[PDB]
Amino acid sequence: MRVWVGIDDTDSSRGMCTTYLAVLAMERVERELGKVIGFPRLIRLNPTIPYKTRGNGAVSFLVEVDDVGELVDVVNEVIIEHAMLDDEKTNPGAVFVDEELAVKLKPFADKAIKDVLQIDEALFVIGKYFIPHLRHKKGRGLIGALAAVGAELEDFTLELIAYRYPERFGTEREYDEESFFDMDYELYPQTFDNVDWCNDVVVCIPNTPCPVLYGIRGESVEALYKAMESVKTEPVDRRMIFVTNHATDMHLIGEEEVHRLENYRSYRLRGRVTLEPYDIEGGHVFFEIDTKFGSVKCAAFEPTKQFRNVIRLLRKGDVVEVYGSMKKDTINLEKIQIVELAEIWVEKNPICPSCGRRMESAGRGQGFRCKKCRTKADEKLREKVERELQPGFYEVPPSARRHLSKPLIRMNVEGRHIFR
Ligand SMILES: Nc1ncnc2c1ncn2[C@@H]1O[C@H](COP(=O)(O)OP(=O)(O)CP(=O)(O)O)[C@@H](O)[C@H]1O
Ligand SMILES: N=C(N)NCCCCN
Ligand SMILES: [Mg+2]
Ligand SMILES: [Mg+2]
Ligand SMILES: [N+]
Ligand SMILES: [Zn+2]
């Protein structure tokens, strides 16, 4: 039969990773049991949750087998040899779900991406549907695993994950940098978010002791493969294309959907600036806006870098739409649409028609003049201020992008200010 397998919470900060484990499980399945139908899926889940370190994606894949139990046995064996069971934050979970049952898991997945789940909820479902499963310690990985199976993808994207040879690991990656930029120039946007031009920093390359060499995000299989032969790196051992929910904003909740705002959720909401932007310790810029939910703290953190500049150009009254996560009662800006800019009438002194300098007061009710010449005016000149802010959309730079964060280049809308 066809059976969805879902895994996660397998890696540790030490140097394993769900997906690598999944690739192994896949390889072992093909040779013992059956074959993998289509591609595996890398499903990003609610990104505010603690216990990440880092990112938050479970993995799933479809297979064809004669016996469910053996398939469980195989996955089970793979976990036992590869999973970082030593760590206390690592808590592998796995599930095995009939095809026509995964659909019943869509709401659960959705709550996993947008909301917060308890283990008892995952456990309730497994008993509800007699879903064969593996819980290895704390059965926490079970949530992500159910989710990796229920997730419906309307918009989806691809990532070509390259993997290192084990003898390398914990060592420093070796790679040709220009090799990557060149590739982005050639194929962007087909492949996207794989490098940060404006910050001369490659982005698809982890800084971490795991098996991943590079993960390249893109749109088609043909473009990804082009990316792969175009790039120069230390020997690639394992490679896998994943269908994902990277770059879809699948985690954002519309304001029309909710009564109050909550920590550990992410939003798209519209407001008018109350407080003006004010800088902070690390290099942060705070400000506040009025919304159907009252005053709300919006922040661009230092890692957003230049994106802070676009923000600093904010003035009370501005109509805005923000995109980001709420933690500690503040919105971490990922994206931002300035809808309507606030008009500001100002009455200043007359400019002198000869010299160009502002006329000084001519005394109480004596109008104005420009002593330097024999020139005079009697009234003030009103005008509208002209700041360097165009309406429309602005995003953080690719080196600050969050896995779920939908990048402008992928949104049809107008006014997109993609900086390169
Ligand atoms: N919305 C949610 N509510 C509650 N728990 C959730 C959740 N989304 C995921 N989880 C669970 O939290 C744990 C996630 O931590 P995990 O270790 O698996 O990193 P994951 O994808 O983030 C990682 P990495 O690439 O390093 O290897 C999982 O057990 C997962 O099932
Ligand atoms: N996998 C990529 N191509 N980009 C990932 C972005 C990571 C930024 N911290
Ligand atoms: Mg994990
Ligand atoms: Mg996971
Ligand atoms: N589904
Ligand atoms: Zn003058």
Coordinates of C-alpha atoms and ligand atoms in Angstrom, one line a residue:
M1 CA 0.0 0.0 0.0
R2 CA 0.9 3.7 -0.3
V3 CA 1.9 5.1 3.1
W4 CA 3.0 8.6 4.2
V5 CA 6.0 8.5 6.6
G6 CA 6.7 11.6 8.7
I7 CA 9.8 12.3 10.9
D8 CA 11.3 15.0 13.0
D9 CA 13.1 16.2 16.2
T10 CA 16.0 13.9 15.2
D11 CA 19.0 16.1 15.1
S12 CA 20.8 18.0 17.8
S13 CA 22.9 21.1 18.0
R14 CA 25.8 18.6 17.9
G15 CA 25.6 17.7 14.2
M16 CA 22.8 15.5 12.8
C17 CA 19.7 16.7 11.0
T18 CA 16.2 15.6 10.1
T19 CA 16.3 15.3 6.2
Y20 CA 19.6 13.7 6.3
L21 CA 18.1 11.1 8.5
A22 CA 15.1 11.1 6.1
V23 CA 17.4 10.7 3.1
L24 CA 18.9 7.7 4.8
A25 CA 15.6 6.2 5.8
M26 CA 14.5 6.8 2.1
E27 CA 17.6 5.0 0.8
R28 CA 17.0 2.1 3.2
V29 CA 13.3 1.8 2.2
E30 CA 14.0 1.6 -1.5
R31 CA 16.3 -1.3 -1.1
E32 CA 14.4 -3.4 1.4
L33 CA 10.7 -2.6 1.0
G34 CA 9.5 -0.6 -2.0
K35 CA 10.1 2.8 -3.6
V36 CA 9.6 6.5 -2.8
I37 CA 6.7 8.1 -4.7
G38 CA 7.5 11.7 -5.8
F39 CA 9.7 13.9 -3.6
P40 CA 10.1 14.2 0.2
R41 CA 8.6 17.3 1.8
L42 CA 10.4 19.8 4.1
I43 CA 7.6 21.4 6.1
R44 CA 8.4 24.5 8.1
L45 CA 6.4 24.8 11.3
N46 CA 5.5 27.6 13.7
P47 CA 8.9 29.6 13.9
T48 CA 8.4 31.1 17.3
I49 CA 8.5 27.9 19.2
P50 CA 11.4 27.2 21.7
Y51 CA 13.4 23.9 21.3
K52 CA 14.3 24.7 17.7
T53 CA 18.0 25.7 17.6
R54 CA 17.4 26.3 14.8
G55 CA 14.6 26.6 12.2
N56 CA 11.6 24.4 12.6
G57 CA 10.9 21.8 9.8
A58 CA 9.7 18.2 9.9
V59 CA 10.1 15.8 7.0
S60 CA 7.7 13.4 5.2
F61 CA 7.6 11.2 2.1
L62 CA 5.2 8.8 0.3
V63 CA 6.1 5.1 -0.3
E64 CA 4.7 1.8 -1.6
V65 CA 5.0 -1.3 0.5
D66 CA 3.4 -4.6 1.3
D67 CA 3.6 -4.5 5.0
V68 CA 3.3 -1.4 7.3
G69 CA 5.1 -3.0 10.2
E70 CA 8.3 -3.8 8.3
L71 CA 8.3 -0.2 7.0
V72 CA 8.0 1.0 10.6
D73 CA 10.8 -1.5 11.6
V74 CA 13.1 -0.1 8.9
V75 CA 12.5 3.6 9.8
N76 CA 12.9 2.6 13.4
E77 CA 16.3 1.0 12.7
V78 CA 17.5 4.1 10.8
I79 CA 16.6 6.4 13.7
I80 CA 18.4 4.2 16.3
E81 CA 21.7 4.4 14.4
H82 CA 21.6 8.0 13.3
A83 CA 19.6 10.0 15.7
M84 CA 21.3 12.0 18.4
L85 CA 19.6 10.2 21.2
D86 CA 22.2 11.4 23.6
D87 CA 20.9 15.0 23.7
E88 CA 18.1 16.0 26.0
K89 CA 16.4 18.4 23.6
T90 CA 16.3 15.7 20.9
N91 CA 13.1 13.6 20.9
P92 CA 12.5 11.8 17.7
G93 CA 8.9 11.0 16.5
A94 CA 7.7 9.1 13.5
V95 CA 4.3 8.3 11.9
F96 CA 3.0 6.1 9.2
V97 CA -0.2 7.1 7.6
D98 CA -2.4 5.7 4.9
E99 CA -2.7 8.0 1.9
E100 CA -6.5 8.7 2.2
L101 CA -5.9 9.5 5.9
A102 CA -3.3 12.2 5.6
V103 CA -6.0 14.6 4.4
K104 CA -7.7 14.3 7.7
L105 CA -4.5 15.7 9.2
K106 CA -4.6 19.0 7.4
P107 CA -6.1 21.0 10.3
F108 CA -3.5 19.6 12.7
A109 CA -0.6 20.6 10.4
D110 CA -2.1 24.0 10.1
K111 CA -2.3 24.5 13.8
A112 CA 1.3 23.4 13.9
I113 CA 2.4 26.0 11.5
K114 CA 0.3 28.9 12.7
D115 CA -0.4 28.0 16.3
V116 CA 1.0 26.0 19.3
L117 CA 0.4 22.3 20.0
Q118 CA 0.6 20.0 23.0
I119 CA 1.9 16.4 22.8
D120 CA -1.3 15.1 24.3
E121 CA -3.0 16.4 21.1
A122 CA -0.7 14.5 18.9
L123 CA -1.3 11.4 21.1
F124 CA -5.1 11.9 20.9
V125 CA -4.9 11.8 17.1
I126 CA -2.7 8.7 16.9
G127 CA -5.1 6.8 19.0
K128 CA -8.1 8.3 17.2
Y129 CA -6.7 6.9 13.9
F130 CA -4.7 3.9 15.1
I131 CA -1.8 5.5 13.3
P132 CA 1.3 3.3 13.7
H133 CA 4.0 5.4 15.2
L134 CA 7.5 5.7 16.8
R135 CA 8.1 7.8 19.9
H136 CA 11.6 7.4 21.1
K137 CA 11.9 9.5 24.3
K138 CA 9.7 12.4 24.9
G139 CA 7.4 11.8 22.0
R140 CA 7.7 15.5 21.0
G141 CA 8.8 14.8 17.4
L142 CA 5.4 13.2 16.9
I143 CA 3.7 16.7 16.5
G144 CA 6.1 17.8 13.7
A145 CA 5.7 14.3 12.1
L146 CA 1.9 14.4 12.0
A147 CA 2.3 18.0 10.7
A148 CA 4.7 17.0 8.0
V149 CA 2.0 14.6 6.8
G150 CA -1.1 16.8 7.1
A151 CA 0.3 20.0 5.5
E152 CA -1.5 21.0 2.4
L153 CA 0.6 23.1 0.0
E154 CA -1.1 25.7 -2.2
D155 CA 2.0 27.6 -2.8
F156 CA 5.2 25.5 -2.4
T157 CA 8.9 25.9 -3.2
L158 CA 11.8 23.6 -3.8
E159 CA 15.1 23.2 -2.0
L160 CA 18.0 21.2 -3.4
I161 CA 19.8 20.1 -0.2
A162 CA 23.4 19.1 -0.8
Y163 CA 25.1 16.9 1.8
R164 CA 28.7 16.5 3.0
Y165 CA 30.6 13.3 3.3
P166 CA 30.7 12.1 7.0
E167 CA 34.5 12.3 7.3
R168 CA 33.9 16.0 6.8
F169 CA 31.4 17.2 9.4
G170 CA 32.2 19.7 12.2
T171 CA 34.9 20.8 9.8
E172 CA 34.8 24.0 7.8
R173 CA 32.9 23.8 4.5
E174 CA 35.0 24.5 1.4
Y175 CA 33.4 26.3 -1.6
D176 CA 33.8 28.8 -4.4
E177 CA 31.9 32.0 -3.6
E178 CA 31.7 33.7 -7.0
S179 CA 30.6 30.3 -8.3
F180 CA 27.4 31.0 -6.3
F181 CA 26.8 34.7 -7.3
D182 CA 27.4 33.9 -11.0
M183 CA 24.7 31.2 -10.6
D184 CA 22.2 33.6 -9.0
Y185 CA 22.8 36.1 -11.8
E186 CA 22.2 33.5 -14.4
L187 CA 19.1 31.9 -12.9
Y188 CA 17.5 34.4 -10.5
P189 CA 14.7 34.4 -9.8
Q190 CA 14.3 30.7 -10.8
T191 CA 16.6 30.2 -7.9
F192 CA 16.2 32.8 -5.2
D193 CA 17.3 33.7 -1.7
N194 CA 20.5 31.7 -2.1
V195 CA 22.8 34.7 -1.8
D196 CA 22.8 38.3 -0.5
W197 CA 24.3 40.7 -3.1
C198 CA 24.0 43.9 -1.1
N199 CA 25.8 42.3 1.8
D200 CA 28.4 40.3 -0.2
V201 CA 27.5 37.2 1.8
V202 CA 26.5 33.8 0.6
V203 CA 23.3 32.6 2.3
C204 CA 22.6 29.0 1.3
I205 CA 25.5 27.7 3.3
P206 CA 25.1 26.8 7.0
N207 CA 27.6 27.8 9.6
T208 CA 26.9 24.7 11.6
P209 CA 28.3 21.2 12.3
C210 CA 25.6 19.3 10.5
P211 CA 25.7 17.2 7.3
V212 CA 24.2 20.0 5.0
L213 CA 26.7 21.5 2.5
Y214 CA 24.3 23.9 0.8
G215 CA 20.5 24.1 0.5
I216 CA 19.4 26.0 -2.6
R217 CA 15.9 27.4 -2.9
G218 CA 14.1 27.6 -6.3
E219 CA 11.1 27.0 -8.5
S220 CA 11.6 24.1 -10.8
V221 CA 13.6 20.9 -10.8
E222 CA 15.4 22.1 -14.0
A223 CA 16.6 25.3 -12.5
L224 CA 17.8 23.6 -9.3
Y225 CA 19.8 21.1 -11.3
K226 CA 21.3 24.0 -13.2
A227 CA 22.3 25.5 -9.9
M228 CA 24.0 22.3 -8.9
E229 CA 26.3 21.7 -11.8
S230 CA 27.1 25.5 -12.0
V231 CA 28.4 25.7 -8.4
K232 CA 31.9 24.7 -7.2
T233 CA 32.3 23.1 -3.7
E234 CA 33.9 20.3 -1.7
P235 CA 32.6 16.9 -2.9
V236 CA 28.9 16.3 -2.7
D237 CA 28.0 13.0 -1.3
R238 CA 24.2 12.9 -0.9
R239 CA 21.7 15.2 -2.6
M240 CA 17.9 15.6 -2.4
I241 CA 15.3 18.0 -3.9
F242 CA 12.5 18.8 -1.4
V243 CA 9.1 20.3 -2.0
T244 CA 8.7 22.9 0.8
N245 CA 6.7 25.7 2.3
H246 CA 9.7 28.0 2.4
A247 CA 8.9 31.5 1.2
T248 CA 5.1 31.3 1.2
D249 CA 4.1 33.2 4.4
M250 CA 2.0 30.2 5.3
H251 CA 2.6 31.1 8.9
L252 CA 1.0 34.6 8.8
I253 CA -2.4 35.2 10.4
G254 CA -4.6 37.9 8.9
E255 CA -5.9 40.4 11.5
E256 CA -9.5 39.7 10.3
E257 CA -9.1 36.2 11.7
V258 CA -8.5 37.0 15.4
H259 CA -9.8 38.8 18.5
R260 CA -6.7 39.5 20.5
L261 CA -3.0 39.3 19.6
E262 CA -0.8 36.6 21.1
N263 CA 2.9 35.8 21.7
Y264 CA 4.1 32.8 19.6
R265 CA 2.1 33.8 16.5
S266 CA 2.8 35.7 13.3
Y267 CA 0.7 38.3 11.6
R268 CA -0.3 40.5 8.7
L269 CA -1.8 43.6 10.2
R270 CA -2.6 47.2 9.3
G271 CA -2.0 50.2 11.6
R272 CA -1.3 53.9 11.8
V273 CA 2.0 55.0 13.4
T274 CA 1.6 56.3 17.0
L275 CA 5.1 56.4 18.5
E276 CA 7.9 57.3 16.1
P277 CA 11.0 55.0 15.5
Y278 CA 13.6 55.1 18.2
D279 CA 17.0 53.3 18.1
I280 CA 18.2 50.8 20.7
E281 CA 21.1 48.7 22.1
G282 CA 22.1 46.2 19.4
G283 CA 21.1 48.5 16.6
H284 CA 17.3 48.2 16.8
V285 CA 14.5 50.5 15.7
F286 CA 11.2 50.5 17.6
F287 CA 7.9 52.2 16.9
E288 CA 4.2 51.8 17.6
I289 CA 1.0 51.7 15.6
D290 CA -2.8 51.8 16.2
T291 CA -4.8 48.7 15.2
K292 CA -8.1 47.0 15.9
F293 CA -6.2 45.6 18.8
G294 CA -4.9 48.9 20.2
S295 CA -1.3 50.1 20.4
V296 CA 1.3 47.6 19.1
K297 CA 5.1 47.4 19.3
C298 CA 6.8 46.8 15.9
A299 CA 10.5 46.4 15.7
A300 CA 13.2 45.9 13.1
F301 CA 16.2 44.1 14.8
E302 CA 19.8 44.8 14.0
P303 CA 20.3 41.7 11.8
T304 CA 17.8 43.3 9.3
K305 CA 20.6 45.8 8.7
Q306 CA 19.8 48.4 6.0
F307 CA 16.1 47.5 6.3
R308 CA 16.3 49.6 9.4
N309 CA 16.9 52.7 7.2
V310 CA 13.6 52.3 5.4
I311 CA 12.0 52.0 8.8
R312 CA 13.6 55.1 10.4
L313 CA 11.8 57.1 7.7
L314 CA 8.5 56.8 9.6
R315 CA 6.4 59.6 10.9
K316 CA 3.3 59.6 13.1
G317 CA 0.0 59.1 11.1
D318 CA 1.5 56.9 8.4
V319 CA -0.8 54.1 7.2
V320 CA 1.1 50.8 7.2
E321 CA 0.8 47.0 6.9
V322 CA 3.3 44.9 8.8
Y323 CA 4.4 41.3 8.5
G324 CA 6.2 39.4 11.3
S325 CA 6.1 37.4 14.5
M326 CA 5.1 38.4 18.0
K327 CA 7.5 37.6 20.7
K328 CA 7.6 39.3 24.1
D329 CA 4.7 41.5 23.0
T330 CA 6.5 42.9 20.0
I331 CA 6.3 42.4 16.2
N332 CA 9.6 41.3 14.6
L333 CA 9.3 42.8 11.1
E334 CA 10.0 40.5 8.2
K335 CA 8.3 42.6 5.5
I336 CA 6.4 45.9 5.3
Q337 CA 3.9 47.7 3.1
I338 CA 3.6 51.4 3.4
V339 CA 0.1 52.0 2.1
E340 CA -0.6 55.7 2.5
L341 CA 2.0 58.2 3.5
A342 CA 1.0 60.8 6.0
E343 CA 0.5 64.3 4.5
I344 CA 2.1 67.0 6.6
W345 CA 1.2 70.7 5.9
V346 CA 3.9 73.1 7.2
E347 CA 3.8 76.9 7.4
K348 CA 7.3 78.4 7.1
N349 CA 8.7 81.8 6.4
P350 CA 9.0 83.2 2.9
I351 CA 12.1 82.3 1.0
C352 CA 13.8 85.4 -0.2
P353 CA 13.3 85.7 -4.0
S354 CA 16.7 87.2 -4.6
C355 CA 19.3 85.5 -2.3
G356 CA 17.3 82.3 -1.6
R357 CA 17.7 82.4 2.2
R358 CA 14.7 82.3 4.5
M359 CA 13.3 85.7 5.5
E360 CA 13.6 86.5 9.1
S361 CA 10.6 88.0 11.1
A362 CA 10.2 91.7 10.4
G363 CA 9.1 92.2 14.0
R364 CA 5.7 91.5 15.6
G365 CA 3.1 92.1 13.0
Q366 CA 5.5 93.5 10.4
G367 CA 5.6 90.5 8.1
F368 CA 9.0 89.4 6.9
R369 CA 11.9 90.7 5.0
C370 CA 15.4 90.0 3.8
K371 CA 17.6 92.8 5.1
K372 CA 20.4 91.6 2.7
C373 CA 18.2 93.0 -0.1
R374 CA 15.4 95.6 0.0
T375 CA 13.0 92.7 -0.4
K376 CA 9.8 92.0 1.6
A377 CA 7.0 89.6 1.9
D378 CA 3.9 89.6 4.2
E379 CA 2.7 86.0 4.4
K380 CA 4.0 82.5 5.1
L381 CA 4.4 79.8 2.4
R382 CA 2.7 76.4 3.1
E383 CA 4.1 73.2 1.6
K384 CA 4.0 69.4 1.8
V385 CA 7.1 67.7 3.2
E386 CA 9.1 65.5 0.8
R387 CA 10.8 62.5 2.4
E388 CA 12.7 59.7 0.7
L389 CA 9.9 57.2 1.2
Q390 CA 7.9 55.8 -1.7
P391 CA 4.7 53.8 -1.0
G392 CA 4.7 50.1 -1.5
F393 CA 6.6 47.0 -0.2
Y394 CA 9.9 46.6 1.5
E395 CA 11.6 43.4 2.8
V396 CA 14.6 42.5 4.9
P397 CA 17.7 41.4 3.1
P398 CA 18.1 37.7 2.1
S399 CA 20.6 37.1 4.9
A400 CA 17.9 38.0 7.4
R401 CA 15.0 36.0 5.7
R402 CA 13.1 33.6 7.8
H403 CA 12.3 30.2 6.2
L404 CA 8.6 30.9 5.9
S405 CA 9.0 34.6 5.0
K406 CA 7.6 35.2 1.5
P407 CA 10.1 37.3 -0.5
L408 CA 8.8 40.2 -2.7
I409 CA 10.2 38.7 -5.9
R410 CA 7.5 36.1 -5.5
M411 CA 4.6 38.5 -5.0
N412 CA 2.8 39.8 -8.0
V413 CA 1.8 43.2 -6.4
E414 CA 3.2 46.6 -7.3
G415 CA 5.7 48.9 -5.5
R416 CA 8.2 46.1 -4.7
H417 CA 11.6 47.5 -3.7
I418 CA 14.0 44.6 -4.2
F419 CA 17.4 45.9 -3.3
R420 CA 20.5 44.5 -5.1
Ligands
LIG1 N1 3.4 24.5 16.4 C1 4.0 23.7 17.2 N2 3.6 23.6 18.5 C2 4.2 22.7 19.4 N3 5.2 22.0 19.0 C3 5.7 22.0 17.8 C4 5.2 22.9 16.8 N4 5.8 22.8 15.7 C5 6.8 21.8 15.8 N5 6.8 21.4 17.1 C6 7.7 20.4 17.7 O1 8.9 21.1 18.3 C7 10.0 20.3 18.1 C8 10.9 21.0 17.1 O2 12.3 21.1 17.4 P1 13.4 20.3 16.3 O3 14.4 19.7 17.0 O4 12.6 19.2 15.7 O5 13.9 21.3 15.2 P2 13.0 21.4 13.7 O6 12.7 21.4 12.6 O7 13.1 22.7 14.2 C9 14.9 21.3 13.2 P3 16.8 21.3 12.4 O8 17.3 21.6 10.7 O9 18.3 21.6 13.0 O10 17.6 20.0 12.1 C10 9.4 19.1 17.4 O11 9.2 18.1 18.3 C11 8.2 19.5 16.8 O12 7.3 18.3 16.6
LIG2 N1 18.9 28.2 1.9 C1 19.0 29.4 1.4 N2 19.2 29.4 0.1 N3 18.9 30.6 2.1 C2 18.7 30.5 3.5 C3 18.6 31.8 4.3 C4 19.2 31.8 5.7 C5 19.3 33.1 6.4 N4 19.7 33.1 7.8
MG3 MG 15.1 17.9 15.5
MG4 MG 11.8 19.1 12.9
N5 N -3.3 16.0 3.4
ZN6 ZN 18.1 88.3 -0.1

